[model samples]
Target: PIHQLQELLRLNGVDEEWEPILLPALMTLEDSYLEWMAAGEGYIPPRDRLLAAFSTLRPNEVRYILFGQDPGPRPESAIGYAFIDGRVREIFSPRGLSREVNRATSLRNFIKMALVARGSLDPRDTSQEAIAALDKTLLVSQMRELRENFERSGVLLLNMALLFTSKEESRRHIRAWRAFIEKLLEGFEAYGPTLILFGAHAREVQKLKSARGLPQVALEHPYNHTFIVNEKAWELFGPMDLLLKR
Candidate 1:
């Protein structure tokens, strides 16, 4: 019996249009995790956060599928969304980019890329002191606001693997999440969201049978220092004004 399956979805805040598509995948996922817990294995981000990306935005609002490898580098960092370190609070400090943002490499690089794209910061000068002096009249200074702005820009921050267990098992979660990705692709095939595949693991989505013909833009993940100056990043994310006040 599929006891509590729908309840799980409901509590996870999945949208109506996407719920049915995700149900089967979640059913198997929940079952596997049930076994995982029974086997004394541990996973981060928990079940409630697994479907957070879908819950954050409706299907109609999704214009880009920004795929990430996993929820985050650490348990506390994985707040359901990709690239966002949930543990981080301020995006900036009175001095410069906050300690939290600097500690979170991907987010820091991304913010710098956006600033460079907006002509507010020169790619050549992305130092903390340089960032501190930029005109912040229109930009945001909260880590949480960054994710909200990403959603507002119609970019869905989805991780290929929604949870993390360990380094050895990291690759395994991708295989486990395959069904979910396939179902997601099938459901959105008609809707046609551009796929923004970043890094090696995020590129795994392109290999999925469901991802055969979708519009795709492949790129290096924002953790790289060069990402701040990546032309493709500028071209793809510049129009969104992701760091601006929404």
Candidate 2:
């Protein structure tokens, strides 16, 4: 168990500042996960990926927190971080977002939101055909660029739950990690990260006593294609230029 904890810490690059606040209860958290997985009850992520949300960006780098969902089902889809699809490399093709990305409704809508927010595409019509007509000379072509762009803007993509087994066990996992999240919020609350609650259960963070007084923006989860046109998304992501290349 200690060995697993050590690897998780290393993989997530758990910050020195965060470690002190998190370590006390974190081992117990991992223990519960291990205990459950031992009985062949869940298809948990490999230990290497379980901490991708943290490793992708450090605590110090976080000025904005995008609260979202843990990965479900597809191993290739949830490579640790929230909302980012691991298997898809190219962010766009000569046509539009590639088939792999476009097939993922939420991702496609999120990309559309960025494009509209940047004024690269008219909000009135965000069809793939419209996107293909836009000039690509000043845009990003790779998925990694989009990830880096988010990180560069000081946004930390955080899922409400860090672990996922299946849809049935989601609430259990979230409850298991609740204490750790509360501790994290307590530690970071004073540091002041703007919270972007991506709707529904994500909005539940506001109920946390620790979440009081922090700055926040709330929007519908991008799973709804209308999220592409959400006024809040336009207002929040517009200034950031989430898809701007370099």
Candidate 3:
């Protein structure tokens, strides 16, 4: 998903790309949580979900969390959150580097955004391509607006995905989210870039305090140009950015 996603962002003119350590890091922790759940054939809870979501967040959520979402109409089935972080380099280089460096390195060397997506809606992916088709669509509008500020400050943050298939699934997803953030902060310390987040996410980030490891902040969504700009989120929260960064 991240591979294809990165291509989409580049095609849409995202100035730079970020290499995210968030998802894979969470996946590692999720492995254990999943194993424990499978052992008991159990489920997770909303409060626990909330708890897990904030675990590894950085204090600079104000700057890094570019987007956010409330539970969807079907909270159980559409618990998706999206985020964009605008601190990155290139998505892929023609001249290959070692696989480890390629995988672990971040976009801080460049200036870009990282978006995190949390659920599903296959048809929406196609819509992303359509937006890219326009001669001058909102995608371009957002890039032009946010890119410079992002580059100067080196902040990477995006939408919040709150859509879910089930409460249990939501809980699991949040757990993974928290872990991803924790690991992400570690990467930031090794790299160099500011960070940002949005309202709810911004608050949560303060509690986590991982942003202190690097330059970071929380942001107010770019109301006019961002995701809410159109009926679909492609305009505002660009998940394609997440593929490379994560």
Candidate 4:
């Protein structure tokens, strides 16, 4: 059973050392879930993506870490990876998605701004809407080239809470999995990836900064309109560009 899980990690291209540190917990987590499923408890993301969160990394090649709150609770959208959803590809393509599945607007914006930061998108067009309004064909072609870029972008997309559930229910899981989550964060120390924290929930893992000797930046959740001081895309994008480049 452990070997099957280990093979899954290996196929996903994780670091060698990660296996020892993470595999046991993964097995236990899976076992507990199997028990719950047998009892009629349900969840999203299917079984395949249960470990999608861990698939973001490659051996020692990590670049940045974008810490998020949790997976989108709805089964239709949640595919395990923190910011990615069913409509992830749509963000780059011309296709539109329902607000329900487009839960990562901020993340999509970040990707758009990241492109701008990296000089892939026009710097003069500061309007997010304008950028979004760019010709669908052009956007599709441009973003298609990013398939490998996104894969090797060296960004570790993770969340404080791994499971998908409503806010109230999620808090309970967060408390339940606190120790495991902390250990998971600590496991990344050897890579020393730059950490970017989003929202209050992500900030809970701030201890990782000191523990891992990693540099970190904080930002309000893109979804949080009220506390958003830097609404302009460039404000957040520029710093990200600077950080990633360094």
TM of each candidate vs. truth = 0.90, 0.88, 0.36, 0.67
Residue range 1-246, candidate 3, lDDT tens digits: 445333432433332323354434434454565454333233322323322223333333323434344333332322122322222233233332223223322221111122212122232341333323323322223322334333233334332332233544655556555655666566556554544454455566666656566554454443322332232333233433323211
What shift in Å separates residue 223 of candidate 4 from its native position after superposition?
Answer: 2.5
Better-scoring candidate (lDDT), 2 or 4? 2
How does model 4 fare in lDDT?
Answer: 0.54
lDDT of 4 by residue, 1-246 (tens): 666666656655555666765765454454665355333235555545655656655536666667666676667666666666554443443343223324565645555455565555565553455555655443333322333344456766665566655667887665655565556556666777767677674457655444346666676666643222343434544544421321
Candidates arranged by TM-score, highest first: 1, 2, 4, 3
Model 2 alpha-carbon drift over 4 Å, by segment: 1-4, 15-17, 24-30, 34-42
Please rank every candidate by lDDT, starting with the best.
Answer: 1, 2, 4, 3
Query: Model 3 off-target regions past 4 Å?
Result: 1-24, 32-163, 167-172, 221-246
Tens-digit lDDT track for model 2 on 1-246?
655555557765755555654565465466666565443344545666666666656667678878766766787777666778777788788787898888888888999999988888888999888988888888888878888888888887777676677888888888888776777777676669998887775568877888776788878889898898888889988888878899
The TM-score leader among the candidates is 1
RMSD of 1: 2.4
Positional deviation of residue 166's Cα in model 2 after best superposition, in angstroms? 2.3
Which candidate, 3 or 4, would have the higher TM-score against the true structure? Answer: 4
lDDT of 2: 0.75
Per-model C-alpha RMSD:
2.4, 2.6, 15.7, 5.4
The Cα RMSD of model 4 versus the native structure comes to 5.4
